[PDB]
Design a protein around this ligand. Structure first.
Ligand SMILES: CCCCCCCC/C=C\CCCCCCCC(=O)OC[C@H](COP(=O)(O)OCCN)OC(=O)CCCCCCC/C=C\CCCCCCCC
Ligand SMILES: CCCCCCCC/C=C\CCCCCCCC(=O)OC[C@H](COP(=O)(O)OCCN)OC(=O)CCCCCCC/C=C\CCCCCCCC
Ligand code: HEC
Ligand code: HEM
Ligand code: HEM
Ligand code: HEM
Ligand SMILES: CO/C=C(/C(=O)OC)c1ccccc1Oc1cc(Oc2ccccc2C#N)ncn1
Ligand SMILES: CCCCCCCCO[C@@H]1O[C@H](CO)[C@@H](O)[C@H](O)[C@H]1O
Ligand SMILES: CCCCCCCCO[C@@H]1O[C@H](CO)[C@@H](O)[C@H](O)[C@H]1O
Ligand SMILES: CCCCCCCCO[C@@H]1O[C@H](CO)[C@@H](O)[C@H](O)[C@H]1O
Lengths: 101, 379, 241, 67, 59, 49, 79, 55, 54
């Protein structure tokens, strides 16, 4: 329900990655699935992610963040990888399951 | 090859680990502790050898050989001070090194993490046996208290202990073997440290944002060679200020008294860096349970890599985990404090609470809050 | 048996991180020890040569050591024998072993004073308070025979009878030997016996700090100078888009 | 004869509101403890509170009058 | 301009930069020690043996 | 195209002597290097001591 | 060998100045300090709390310990 | 300086023990270097001609 | 072992006479030193004769 639908927006702002201009998916730990997922991203999405991240690291080494204006807004955050990552995991679970059978 | 820094079979190693080695552009000051630990180690070994050249491992001469060193050897007092206080600088640095890794999920580098736990266990053993050498009151009693705990292991109890002592109590044959061990272990530490860095170089360093820094890497030199040198003097100042202006601030006055097997000191307590574990020890009334709880207080570190639930590496963007992290740190100051207090009310109950919350936070809360936060990110 | 009084913090002239020992006070404190405490208290780690250039002249030191007969040997026939002291000898032990020490002090054992101010919490503040803190036991408290009441000693019943009283000796430097004056001096002396490096250690602390201040500033600038390149760095994303 | 500044400053300090109160509770304890014949009580605590108050005061001034 | 002269004469060729550090250290030590010792003794007037020595120094 | 690319403004960071775009920056170079190298040479002396 | 095999990067331009053309510690008041404050502010309520809590527990326990050492007059009112 | 005094005496013995305990570890370390350089070429053989044709 | 002129000689004797197999260990260590050198001289010889030094 629209209850935690608020909690989320709260956590999202509590987290603070949007202050670096990073999308939620930009902050994912690159394990095996995430790595495969990233290989499937379209060139443009991939290069944008790259700049966003390189930018964040530069802000981090400088000990600065983006001006309040540039912060990613909860509702404008692009879940650009979740779709691919979801597929990668199913495929994997399919194989795992099948290899047992 | 063009430059001899890459071709040569040795420089090539010095280059691929201290000069042309790719480092994240955004690593903070928490990444300065590895090098300090390395420098810390080179300094202990150095001051240790200088002291060893005047020490005599015999119950009848240990105490005075140390006194002779301080009183007659040129700068013996300085070396003794530096070595003794260096042990603390070493632990301060190591706890901050460990903290940093827990807070930034560096432990996901399993082998680097495990060798690191081994380094810590070896460092402890070293400091433990090193502490006995001066053969003062806390030296002997500490040895006595702790080594007796193990006679509580069923069956191989009294056996393992009497074997370790080389007799029926902590006596001369213990001192001499402890000196050999104290001289030996630091070299094992130096060796394992090489392995630590070898596994580390497999992946390279993790960074504060916990995301891939391949997009922005800089050569270790001059960025980190300078950053680390600076970090050396910044820490080295409080160190020397302590070893020169307050030499005995951290030491037990009880150790300025020759060991005496017929006089138990009133308060047998360890050095600050062991207090937290001593607290957990006494929290479990039951010789066997306390020993296990003691052991586990450090062995727990081997489990961290398996209790990671977050979808993100660090705790930078995880507010709930962040407070849980500082609760833990506070938890440890409490245990440290409890450890230095007598075993009485209210300290006893507070002790059991802090010991109990210590394990709860690492075994139960951290993995739980981590999962919770994954849901709050809609993952 | 429970409850303990903690000494106060006196303003010793050697308490400051940059303040040395008052060698004049140390020299007197030595006299106190020599003429009072040395009767029961050993000081195994100090030798007469140690006084030279600290509190005494080389001649004074040599004289002080000769006042003592030390046991040397064996001789031609494997016999022990006496001889006058050299400045290489350490302060004489009042007793052969602790059994004899206790035997002469009601089974109590006066400890070696070489490291006493470090072997006790409180240090010189403790020793000073103890020496000047003897008094009568409060109501309900009985001190067993042979022991004396001192609130500052744990358990309050000490085996050492008040060692010092006014004019118990005369400072040959012409200082009013009041009881507190004496305790003050002997404590200062004991601080020195525990750590002769004291002054040098502090002089070194001064140099350490200055060089530390200088060197850290300098290195901060260099670290900043090099990183300035990444600190001010600017980047842009320019896709064909 | 000679006079020990310690004893002098001890008097001056015992004439302090702090000590006067502690000294007062002490005399009372002494009183009832001395007047019974099967009590456990002792006046250590009261004596300590007094000595603590006094001696803390003596420290502030004593070394001024010593060489 | 000292900075320019310094640069040209001392900091430009690596050989001279090393010579400056050595010669600079020899001079810095001499001065720094005298100074620190100076400070230490002033902050401790009449407390050091150096100070009271004359009283017993008289063969 | 690359013709539309220009270097951002570093006025917020430039050292005083190279702040003005119409002045030869060489004239103040031995000054800027001489200063930074002076700090370094001093660090060495402090360390050699 | 680790430089040149790291990441596939495209379309990013970066501009940098020699260290001798710029200042080591620029804009201390307009940029530095403000940020130091910003950083302090953003963390204080995450770090401080548990440490404050620790302190309290410490004070209580220390005083509660000294209090149990004092005598309760209610044990001698009878005699 | 080496003797720590005017003749071979106790201060020499104690520092010799320290050295004797220490050097063997340096030997173990340098041995690793020895084999590291060795592996750059591989072993030489009794006929002194290239053995790449038969390893 | 005890590194002190007054205890060295006897600490070694104590080791040989009281420590379980102390005599064996002492022998092996002392004689091992010769085995070490025999081996090293043959190691060096070999290298001189086969030009390993290249
Ligand atoms: C263990 C033995 C116990 C001994 C006592 C423990 C020592 C206690 C000393 C207190 C520690 C002092 C450090 C306080 C510094 C406060 C601070 O800066 O925190 C905020 C800051 C914010 O970081 P970001 O979220 O990445 O910011 C980026 C976006 N702007 O957090 C950090 O610096 C990361 C924390 C790393 C340091 C942890 C040090 C604590 C040390 C204790 C050991 C704990 C681990 C368990 C060991 C078991 C054995
Ligand atoms: C009386 C004493 C006199 C005798 C002392 C002799 C010592 C002299 C040493 C030789 C002189 C050094 C020559 C350096 C030349 C190399 C060089 O390029 O400079 C160093 C170079 C600087 O780079 P640039 O600024 O780009 O310079 C470019 C020049 N055109 O690298 C450095 O930053 C090194 C200097 C910083 C030192 C940092 C050391 C920090 C250590 C502190 C802890 C204390 C020390 C304790 C020692 C432990 C011993 C067991
Ligand atoms: C008659 C021998 C005698 C003289 C003289 C004497 N002492 Fe003692 N002292 C003792 C004895 C006995 C004890 C042991 C007390 C005990 O443990 O009950 C003692 C103990 C001590 C202690 C404290 C022990 C502790 O556990 O805290 C100190 C410090 C001390 N003496 C200082 C002095 C100094 C300073 C002097 C000279 C001013 C002095 N004594 C002179 C006999 C003496
Ligand atoms: C004698 C002790 C040790 C030495 C000399 C040592 C040295 C180092 C060094 C030099 C680094 C690289 C720089 C840095 O990241 O700080 C490093 C990294 C690391 N060490 Fe240690 N270490 C020691 C103990 C440990 C311990 C006790 C742990 C944890 C139980 C540990 C865990 C790690 C990990 C996981 C990293 C990765 C850092 C990152 O996230 O990038 N180390 N250590
Ligand atoms: C990992 C490095 C080391 C640690 C953590 C360490 C720690 C300690 C500690 C805790 C003590 C007791 C300090 C005290 O007197 O209160 C000690 C004493 C001593 N250490 Fe080490 N030590 C280290 C390395 C060495 C090495 C390599 C040697 C020399 C071979 C050595 C020789 C000595 C000697 C001779 C003493 C006894 C004299 C003394 O107490 O000062 N130590 N060490
Ligand atoms: C603690 C002493 C030493 C150790 C542990 C050691 C070990 C080794 C080992 C394991 C090898 C490979 C096996 C072999 O060819 O025998 C080797 C090869 C070699 N060592 Fe040593 N060595 C030592 C001392 C020396 C010395 C003293 C020399 C000569 C000064 C030397 C010269 C060589 C050379 C030139 C080779 C190449 C052998 C070939 O021609 O293939 N080694 N050594
Ligand atoms: C020989 O006693 C050495 C002591 C010491 O503190 O050395 C630095 C010591 C002194 C007094 C009382 C106990 C002492 O030893 C110790 C040893 C100790 O060891 C451990 C630390 C962490 C985890 C497990 C153990 C064990 N066993 N934990 C706490 N105190
Ligand atoms: O890790 C590093 O790995 C390198 C490659 O094996 C080694 O040469 C270095 O000595 C080691 O420190
Ligand atoms: C105060 O005496 C000091 O004793 C030291 C002994 O280590 C000497 O090196 C100093 O030069 C001397 O001033
Ligand atoms: C962080 C770097 C700290 C280095 C501090 C160096 C200071 C050591 O200075 C020392 O002072 C003593 C007292 O005057 C002298 O006796 C020593 O010879 C001298 O080396």
């Amino acid at each position: 329900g629209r209850l935690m639908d608020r909690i989320r927006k709260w956590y999202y702002n509590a987290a603070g990655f949007n202050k670096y201009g990073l999308m939620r998916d930009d902050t994912l730990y690159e394990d095996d699935d995430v790595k495969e997922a990233l290989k499937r991203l379209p060139e443009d999405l991939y290069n944008e992610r790259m700049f966003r991240i390189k930018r964040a690291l530069d802000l981090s080494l400088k000990h600065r963040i983006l001006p309040k204006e540039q912060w990613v807004k909860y509702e404008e955050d692009k879940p650009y990888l979740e779709p691919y990552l979801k597929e990668v995991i199913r495929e994997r679970l399919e194989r795992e399951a099948w290899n047992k059978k | 090859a063009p430059n001899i820094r890459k071709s040569h079979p040795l420089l090539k190693m010095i280059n691929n680990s201290l000069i042309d080695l790719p480092a994240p552009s955004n690593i903070s000051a928490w990444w300065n502790f590895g090098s300090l630990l390395a420098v810390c180690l080179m300094t202990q070994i150095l001051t240790g050898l200088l002291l060893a050249m005047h020490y005599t491992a015999d119950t009848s001469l240990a105490f005075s050989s140390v006194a002779h060193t301080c009183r007659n050897v040129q700068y013996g007092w300085l070396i003794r001070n530096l070595h003794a206080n260096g042990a603390s600088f070493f632990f301060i640095c190591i706890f901050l090194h460990i903290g940093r890794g827990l807070y930034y999920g560096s432990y996901l580098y399993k082998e680097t993490w495990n060798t690191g736990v081994i380094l810590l266990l070896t460092l402890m053993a070293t400091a433990f046996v090193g502490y006995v050498l001066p053969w003062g009151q806390m030296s002997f009693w500490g040895a006595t208290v702790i080594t007796n705990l193990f006679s509580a292991i069923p069956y191989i109890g009294h056996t393992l202990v009497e074997w370790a002592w080389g007799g029926f109590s902590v006596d001369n044959p213990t001192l001499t073997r402890f000196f050999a061990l104290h001289f030996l272990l630091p070299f094992a530490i130096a060796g394992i440290t090489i392995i630590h860095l070898t596994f580390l170089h497999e992946s390279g360093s993790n960074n504060p944002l916990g995301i891939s820094s391949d997009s922005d890497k800089i050569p270790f030199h001059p960025y980190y060679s300078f950053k680390d040198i600076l970090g050396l003097t910044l820490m080295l100042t409080p160190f020397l200020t302590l070893a020169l202006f307050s030499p005995n601030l951290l030491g037990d006055p009880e150790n300025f008294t020759p060991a005496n097997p017929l006089v138990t000191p009133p308060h047998i307590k360890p050095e600050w860096y062991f207090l937290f574990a001593y607290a957990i020890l006494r929290s479990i009334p039951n010789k066997l349970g306390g020993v296990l709880a003691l052991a586990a207080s450090v062995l727990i570190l081997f489990l961290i890599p398996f209790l990671h639930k977050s979808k993100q590496r660090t705790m930078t963007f995880r507010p709930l985990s962040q407070t849980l992290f500082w609760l833990l740190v506070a938890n440890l100051l409490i245990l440290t404090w409890i450890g230095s207090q007598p075993v009485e009310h209210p300290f006893i109950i507070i002790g059991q609470m802090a010991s109990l919350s210590y394990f709860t936070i690492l075994l139960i809360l951290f993995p739980t809050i981590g999962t919770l936060e994954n849901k709050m990110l809609n993952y | 048996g429970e409850l303990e009084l903690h000494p106060p913090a006196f303003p010793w002239s050697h308490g400051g991180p940059l303040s040395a020992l008052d060698h004049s006070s140390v020299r007197r404190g030595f006299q106190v020890y020599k003429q009072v405490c040395s009767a029961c208290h050993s000081m195994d780690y100090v030798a007469f040569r140690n006084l030279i250039g600290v509190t005494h002249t080389e001649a004074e030191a040599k004289a002080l050591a000769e006042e003592v007969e030390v046991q040397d040997g064996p001789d031609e026939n494997g016999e022990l024998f006496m001889r006058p002291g050299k400045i290489s000898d350490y302060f004489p032990k009042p007793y052969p072993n602790p059994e004899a020490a206790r035997a002469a002090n009601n089974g109590a054992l006066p400890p070696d004073l070489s490291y006493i101010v470090n072997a006790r919490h409180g240090g010189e503040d403790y020793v000073f308070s103890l020496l000047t803190g003897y008094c009568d036991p409060p109501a309900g408290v009985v001190v067993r025979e042979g022991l004396h009441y001192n609130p500052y000693f744990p358990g309050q019943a000490i085996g050492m009878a008040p060692p010092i009283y006014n004019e118990i000796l005369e400072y040959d430097d012409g200082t009013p030997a009041t009881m507190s004056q004496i305790a003050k001096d002997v404590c200062t002396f004991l601080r020195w016996a525990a750590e002769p490096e004291h002054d040098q250690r502090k002089r070194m602390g001064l140099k350490m700090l200055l060089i530390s201040a200088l060197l850290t500033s300098l290195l901060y600038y260099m670290k900043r100078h090099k990183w300035s390149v990444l600190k001010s760095r600017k980047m842009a994303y320019r896709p064909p888009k | 004869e000679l006079v020990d500044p310690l004893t002098t400053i001890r008097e001056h300090c015992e004439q302090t509101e702090k000590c006067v109160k502690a000294r007062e509770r002490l005399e009372l304890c002494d009183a009832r403890v001395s007047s019974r014949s099967h009590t456990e009580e002792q006046c250590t605590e009261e004596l300590f509170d007094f000595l603590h108050a006094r001696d803390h005061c003596v420290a502030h001034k004593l070394f001024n009058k010593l060489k | 301009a000292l900075l320019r002269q310094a640069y040209s004469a001392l900091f430009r060729r690596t050989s001279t930069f090393a010579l400056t550090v050595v010669l600079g250290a020899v001079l810095f030590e001499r001065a720094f020690d005298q100074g620190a010792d100076a400070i230490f003794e002033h902050l401790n007037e009449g407390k050091l043996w150096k100070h009271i020595k004359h009283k017993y120094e008289a063969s | 195209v690359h013709n539309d690319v220009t270097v951002p403004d570093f006025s917020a960071y430039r050292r005083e002597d190279v702040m003005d775009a119409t002045t030869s920056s060489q004239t103040s170079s031995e000054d800027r290097k001489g200063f930074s190298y002076l700090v370094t040479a001093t660090a060495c002396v402090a360390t050699a001591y | 060998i680790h430089f040149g095999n790291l990441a596939r990067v495209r379309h990013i331009i970066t501009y940098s100045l020699s260290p001798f053309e710029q200042r080591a510690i620029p804009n201390i008041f307009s940029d530095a300090l403000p940020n130091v404050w910003r950083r302090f502010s953003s963390q204080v309520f995450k770090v401080a709390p548990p440490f404050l809590g620790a302190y309290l527990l410490y004070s209580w326990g220390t005083q509660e310990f000294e209090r149990l050492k004092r005598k309760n007059p209610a044990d001698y009112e009878n005699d």
